[PDB]
A paper describes a structure:
SARS-CoV-2 encodes 16 non-structural proteins (nsp) to assemble a so-called replication and transcription complex (RTC) to facilitate virus replication and transcription. Among them, nsp12 functions as RNA-dependent RNA polymerase (RdRp) by using nsp7 and nsp8 as its auxiliary factors, and nsp13 is identified as a helicase. Two nsp13 molecules bind on the plain region formed by two nsp8 and nsp12. In nsp13-2, the bound 5′ extension of RNA template is in an extended conformation and lies in an RNA-binding channel formed by nsp13 1A, 1B, and 2A domains, with a direction of its 5′ end in 2A domain and its 3′ end in 1A domain.
Cryo-EM grids were prepared, and preliminary screening revealed ideal particle density with good dispersity. After collecting and processing 4107 micrograph movies, we identified two major classes of mini RTC and reconstructed their structures to the resolution of 2.98 Å (form 1, 83,144 particles (75.6% of total particles)) and 3.84 Å (form 2, 26,768 particles (24.4% of total particles)). Although the overall architectures of two mini RTCs are generally similar, the conformations of nsp13-1 have a distinct shift. In the alignment of two forms of mini RTC, nsp7–nsp8–nsp12 and nsp13-2 present a r.m.s.d of 0.429 Å for 1905 Cα atoms, suggesting their highly similar conformations. However, nsp13-1 in form 1 mini RTC has a ~10 Å movement towards nsp13-2, compared with they are in form 2 mini RTC. In mini RTC, nsp13 molecules have three major contacting regions (regions 1, 2, and 3) and two minor regions (regions 4 and 5) with nsp7–nsp8–nsp12 or with each other. Region 1 includes the interaction between nsp13-1 1B domain and nsp12 Interface; region 2 includes the interaction between nsp13-1 ZBD domain and nsp8-1 helical domain; region 3 includes the 1B interaction between nsp13-1 and nsp13-2; region 4 includes one main chain hydrogen bond interaction between nsp13-2 ZBD and nsp8-2; region 5 includes a faint hydrophobic contact between nsp13-2 1A and nsp12. The movement of nsp13-1 results in distinct variations on its interaction with other components in region 1 and 3, and minor difference in region 2; whereas, the interactions in region 4 and region 5 are identical in two forms of mini RTC. In contrast in form 2 mini RTC, nsp13-1H320 and nsp13-1Q194 move away from the interface domain of nsp12, losing the two hydrogen bonds in region. And in region 3, nsp13-1E244 and nsp13-1R248 in nsp13-1 1B domain also lost their interactions with nsp13-2Y217 and nsp13-2T216 of nsp13-2 1B domain. For note, because the resolution of form 1 mini RTC is better than that of form 2, we can build six nucleosides of the 5′ extension of RNA template in nsp13-2 in form 1 mini RTC, but only build five nucleosides in nsp13-2 in form 2; nevertheless, the bound 5′ extensions of RNA template in nsp13-2 in two forms are in similar conformation.
Residue numbers in the entry:
A (entry chain A): 271 to 929
B (entry chain F), C (entry chain E): 1 to 596
D (entry chain B): 100 to 192
The structure:
Amino acid sequence: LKYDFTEERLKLFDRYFKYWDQTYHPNCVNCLDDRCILHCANFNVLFSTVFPPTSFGPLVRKIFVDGVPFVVSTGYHFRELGVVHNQDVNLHSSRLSFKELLVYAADPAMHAASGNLLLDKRTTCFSVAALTNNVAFQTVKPGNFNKDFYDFAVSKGFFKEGSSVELKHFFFAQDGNAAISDYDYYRYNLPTMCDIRQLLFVVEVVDKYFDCYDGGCINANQVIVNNLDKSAGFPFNKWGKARLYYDSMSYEDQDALFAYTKRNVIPTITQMNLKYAISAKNRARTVAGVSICSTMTNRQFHQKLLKSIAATRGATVVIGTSKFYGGWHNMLKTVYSDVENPHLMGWDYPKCDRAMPNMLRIMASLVLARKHTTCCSLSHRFYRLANECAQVLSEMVMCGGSLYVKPGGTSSGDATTAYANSVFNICQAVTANVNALLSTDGNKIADKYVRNLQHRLYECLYRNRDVDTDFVNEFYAYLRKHFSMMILSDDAVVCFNSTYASQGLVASIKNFKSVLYYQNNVFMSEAKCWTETDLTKGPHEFCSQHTMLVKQGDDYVYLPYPDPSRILGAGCFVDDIVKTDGTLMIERFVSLAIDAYPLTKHPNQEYADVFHLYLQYIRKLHDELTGHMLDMYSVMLTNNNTSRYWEPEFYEAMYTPHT
Amino acid sequence: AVGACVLCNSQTSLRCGACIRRPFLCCKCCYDHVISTSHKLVLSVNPYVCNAPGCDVTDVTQLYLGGMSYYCKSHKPPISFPLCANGQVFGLYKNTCVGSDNVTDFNAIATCDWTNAGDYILANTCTERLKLFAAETLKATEETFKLSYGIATVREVLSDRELHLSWEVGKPRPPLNRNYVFTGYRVTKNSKVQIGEYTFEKGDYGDAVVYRGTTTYKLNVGDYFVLTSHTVMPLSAPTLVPQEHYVRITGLYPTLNISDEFSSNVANYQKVGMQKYSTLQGPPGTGKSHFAIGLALYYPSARIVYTACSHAAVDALCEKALKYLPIDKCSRIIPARARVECFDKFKVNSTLEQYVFCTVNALPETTADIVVFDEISMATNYDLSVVNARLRAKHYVYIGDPAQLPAPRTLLTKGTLEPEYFNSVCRLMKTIGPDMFLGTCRRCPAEIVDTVSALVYDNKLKAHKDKSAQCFKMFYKGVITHDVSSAINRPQIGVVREFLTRNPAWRKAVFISPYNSQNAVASKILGLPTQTVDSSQGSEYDYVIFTQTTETAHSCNVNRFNVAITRAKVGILCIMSDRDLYDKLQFTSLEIPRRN
Amino acid sequence: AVGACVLCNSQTSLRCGACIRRPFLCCKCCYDHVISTSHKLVLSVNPYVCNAPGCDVTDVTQLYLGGMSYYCKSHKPPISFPLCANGQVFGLYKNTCVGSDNVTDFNAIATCDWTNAGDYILANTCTERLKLFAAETLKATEETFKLSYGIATVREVLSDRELHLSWEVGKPRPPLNRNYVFTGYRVTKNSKVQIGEYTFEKGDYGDAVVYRGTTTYKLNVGDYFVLTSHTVMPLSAPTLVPQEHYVRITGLYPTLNISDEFSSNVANYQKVGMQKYSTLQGPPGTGKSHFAIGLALYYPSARIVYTACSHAAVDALCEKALKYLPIDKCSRIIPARARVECFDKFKVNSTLEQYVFCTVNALPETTADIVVFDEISMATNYDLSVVNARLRAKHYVYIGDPAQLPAPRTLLTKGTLEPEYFNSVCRLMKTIGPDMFLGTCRRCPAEIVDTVSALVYDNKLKAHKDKSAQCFKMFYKGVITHDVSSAINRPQIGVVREFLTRNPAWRKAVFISPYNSQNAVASKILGLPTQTVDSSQGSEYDYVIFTQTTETAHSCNVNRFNVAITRAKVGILCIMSDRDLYDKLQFTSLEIPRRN
Amino acid sequence: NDALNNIINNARDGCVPLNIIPLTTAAKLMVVIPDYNTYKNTCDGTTFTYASALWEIQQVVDADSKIVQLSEISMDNSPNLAWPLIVTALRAN
RNA sequence: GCGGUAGUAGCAUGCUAGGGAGCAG
RNA sequence: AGCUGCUCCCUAGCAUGCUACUACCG
RNA sequence: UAAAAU
Ligand SMILES: [Zn+2]
Ligand SMILES: [Zn+2]
Ligand SMILES: [Zn+2]
Ligand SMILES: [Zn+2]
Ligand SMILES: [Zn+2]
Ligand SMILES: [Zn+2]
Ligand SMILES: [Zn+2]
């Protein structure tokens, strides 16, 4: 029954960390700034490995309403944040309005306690409960085949043995032990205590990376939800999609609820789902649908900053910037800036979404939140952070028909994924820079300036205890002058000086290796990190596109061409009515060809043949379409204007800087 | 939010917010109600107000359709046209609306006060929808009149039944009635926590009142008692289903020949299976209830519900019932209320045994083959429709004599309501008959029924063992010395001073009197216990002395008097001025200054 | 909403809404059906009328498509197209349809009223799809005619089931038969309310009539009864799956030496498995049924389904099966119908058992190895397509005798059908050859066999077993006590009384009657369980009784007579007035006082 | 159930961690088993213990959700079943 | 013969909304 | 049965803008 | 004027 455990943590601290000259707070609620939140949650991570794992999560309590007993959560015990009690609980009420109905529906407490005990041996993940008398298994049907197009492609000489291009992407099927055997992958998530002193500075540098934006709380009447019809999490998927809910609430219910989370905590329930789309590796891929209750708020709390990021060019982040109309060239040019001996490189984090230790997720949430300097108070921000963590870190996953606990890692589909992952990425990069720089024979560095830099760096890192600004600024400039980074949500490209990198003055790759090892619990074989010496050919690969330098008229421009096999596969395999009898679906092929235009300018042969193939196929499509429509009635249409679709120039327009 | 017109049943989306209940009026019907009354506010999906802020004009007749809103004449935009026109109002389906011309009585109801007889007379004489609306309305009026009360301050906590509760000033104190069940609170400082419910009543002396609580949470000098309040729910089912006849019984399994002492009842029992429902005229303690239990026996393989409204009634029913019944029974009444103790037999919530016994507001959505309800002289049409809404049995039956006393319906002040209109089924039984008359008596002596059948009955019910010493010592009433409002008849009790000792064998009686302070001042000059008609319904005191109050009909309330007679085993004394009433209770005519 | 041309199977979107059943038509076909017939209204994705309000020119040949919409001659837009143009009618795929020459006989079908064998004689000889459509519209016309009957009301109630009814003056009154059902409406003012389904039957006199009801409702006087109509689904399966062969038996597996009593037929058993389907002609119930069950035995693991049209037929068959089969058998026969009771053994609905028996119209939609239709000499091509649609198996076997009794198909009243044209397989038997045949009686006394072979057969049978106790009192026909035109002759039983007692052991026989109501009255002055000649054709008996109505055409029908007299094993007797047939029958007639 | 109320009253405050509610107070347990050896090392036999309590086995189904008896669960008959079984057991007193 | 107020149809821009489809993480 | 981001296509609507010719006053 | 339908 015991769940407090405070003087125990203090006792441990005293028995070991006796002279760690800084006050420790067993409950972050009692923290000062944020940096105190970090320096306390860090220790909490280490200490929470000792206590029973059946003593974390929601902290429920019996209440009464209209002379009736309920069980609802009134707090939480975070293995990194200690105890937290809801601030506005009310015993004994008469009736229930809408928002309170909701917050008592989206909670696991009443759900779980009304469930039958579960113990599964399929997973080492700590199960919790089941809601039925029969676990469910979901499969993944195989894709449907489009023949006539395949026969066509054959007829024009493709797919002959020994050809360069062939079919490699398909619709893999999955049996019944898929969902759980996938979800189990969280066994790669470990409780890791990240070094705190250097973190307290890498976080400063990362912050400096985000100076040119702006955000804050926004009023409910100002949010924007593109596509109002997505699944509504659990159990709201038992009624309808989002629009139903986003409608039945006033512009104040949303405001009341938002302002309610700023002082209380709301657990949630996440669902797993099996993505159904082409790929190239048979291991299935899944997605986490979050409850409406968390999104409906995180929107109001972040969308301002988000939109502020999604519309800015030339930034180190590049999200939202479209590659068409030569934009891609702008990105690749600005990421060159002016590095003295430019080399290019890229890497990739194996199982990036599972392996992320909790500390870094919290660090990312903090860096995002730091913009709320005024749209909130200061306990408000902490409660917001708490609700966030409790909703997208150790919440109760609802897999199959049973509730398990998610030990950590990023929920694949929260409100703030893509940005969070990017922040994490930059954090890792900076950490690697710091490690490599400190870790070299200071008595051998020749450029006196750099030597002084390294010395004062160590000094500011271990000795001084309060933030310095000037050194932070100088260092940020140094990095932007010798390490230039184009970032996406985990997918990176780094243009860096070679000469320094030789003398270990910027991180090479082995630095990345050691960093992922000792701070992310995984190992990154150099079988996927790619390097590059000749800029005239662009980076090896980025967002699954290759880059090619083509003469567009008078000048030369970088263009992204995809991977042909992917395009062909998208042509050949679909979901029933789609493409099958594609004489009604031309636009599919229009867009596809759009994606496959640059293959025209390619040195190797079959590539451009792919383009011409798509063209001629479109033409035959429209032709045999009109032929049928004529017989169906007796007069063809008046004005189709579809002929433009099979002339090359129209596609070319999609890559030229004037729109 | 959308529904059918309460009068013409047209699908509509209008509500006369000036009407308390906000019913659904068709377009034409709404137009009529508003052009006819002072009901000058109409609601649809939205209220109809000049949306121009500051202009608090509400009525439709001066509102104009704005670009997409509503505005007053002064505030109406250039293109703005009024709402009410063509005898119709802008409302949905305004093409298919039909309306009707019965806005007259509907209006009268939307305007009545429920304080007088004619209101109710109209009520139990109109169309079904109008009847239900009237019930809703009068119940809401009673609700707000209840809300007119207030809290109190506790002087002391004398005992578990003796309490010192002074009422908050500037408020009509809620009197001493079981009906006054109060939500008690123990103010920590802080702590809007209900410690339970506690109700109060006049014991054996004042001003120390008696109080019973659903929980024995002992009070102190610091609690405060709010009046329990809530909202009336609307109703859907009619008062009763239309009657149906059958050439046989539908799924009823008659018993072969067990306990044929109810044989004269079986001749009636099968009749039940032939009719969708029926009714019953009978004095209490007679085949009253007895018949119903013998019936449940007669079909021992059928789900049956027994209901009342009074917990006293459900105890008078459930006991005597478990007697001839396996146990193996169901009477699962109260989950977490009941100011007093209730059923004592089984479980609260799984609708198990084929025979359940409960109270109206406790009956959930359950089914049976037959539902039975006594007490019909007391419940309201509201209550009947509630019954229909909570039960879906295949048969129904109604038991009771309008000779008893009905619901308090406190608002009555000018005039009295006839049993002719207590409610629907009663209006029928008194306008067409019960279709079954019930006899005869069991407990009481004959002389207390042979003369008392000369009054409400037509010398119909019969009993025996007329002894002993049941007389009418009709004493011409003394002067009016009433301490509180209700009458102090101490000179009338001055007939028993010379008799508290003249009855050594009759030291086992119980005082009765209509006015409760006539029970009080008697409790002052007491030597023998008291018990008024209020907490009656299913018991008998051996001896009793009927003590009459003021010549006002509050004393000889032939219903109240009669029921005060029917609850006796041996003897009675009747003491009233009595110019004519004593010509209906024929006993040894006795006087007071003379002892014979 | 497209389809195939009923004559060309081409794509189209038209239906001669003037023709009853709305069949799809190609362009040219539609043009020809419309140009040569009063049939004019054509329906497409929309109706074809002038969209200008008021113009009701519905002869399509006058109409013009305007802008998107259709228009008359006058209200036509300035620009348009004439619809009925160039020997065609404009519809989808107009330029693709082929058209053909089956239009004449087509219109002949669509325009007949099924009154003279000619339209039949063509109905049974057109193309298969056309045949289908023909059967559809036939059954539809039957249903529509059924509506023509009058309406009935109640006049006064007599008992629970004894009643006096009132018929519509001047309207056809349908007969009292278990194959009729009436929805009961009673009307309050208002409240024309259905009360339930009620069949009827004549009581002991007029107009006391019995009735079986759906519920135990009480009856009134403001009540009435409407015979309930019916609908007709469209069909799409052919009548006969294309005939085939194979080189070796597949699907089914013989035993070894089991049951030699079925010896010679094994030859037929192989070739049956060797074809896709086949037929067998056999005099009454001899090898018929016998051979079917024998084959069923022959291939054990073979899942087999029996089915026919006559309930008594499938019943006799299921009992004959019970005589020899594992049980391990069911007759999944009748849901909430079975006005006449039937099967007594097993379930009605699991479709697990290997040997499933049922009636055609109540069949499920299932598969099996083989299926054996029975009594094709009575069914219509309609039912054949029905069974080919609901079921689906490998080997089919049809059995019957084109000298038996066909479908009544009452509507025809002018001329007579050659048996050859009862339906498809009837032709098949009569045309090319019955593929397999059987010629010997195993069920009947030799004397009646001689008589029949002397009659409708060409002296082409043999059997066993002769005497005795057979006669043909040519007793004059007494009063035709015909209730409705359905015949009754009580003085015919006026001599049954003389064999109601003289009968030494002829007490367990079955009686047979040309008419249903004279059969019912036989059940009144009862002698034994009786039946109708139609409800026969399936069982044999030692003794059988037969009295006839007058010499009406239905009565003197030679085929009815044959199938009647051929239901007996050792004793038989038939009583017609008889001007000629007793000259053909070979027994020992007597006189009214001569009965031993 | 009253035992829930009971353990509530045992709290120094009236708030208890969620995870231990069903662990102690559920009335029926469901266990999911992959492979035979694993089954042997748990709910082998007709009753077993778990979470300091005694559970009794009754009614055992398969992936296809068809009933199976304990007899069939041999070592060598196992390669004949939809083999991640569901076992539902009851709280034995 | 010009200028201001009323129509028409056309054109251009844009903004919203609605709907379909594809790619990247 | 997710979170975003870009892109194409179709449709409606509003308003603008503009065009001109048709009607009133200057 | 003879059979006879989730
Ligand atoms: Zn701290
Ligand atoms: Zn904020
Ligand atoms: Zn109305
Ligand atoms: Zn106004
Ligand atoms: Zn026609
Ligand atoms: Zn045709
Ligand atoms: Zn016209």
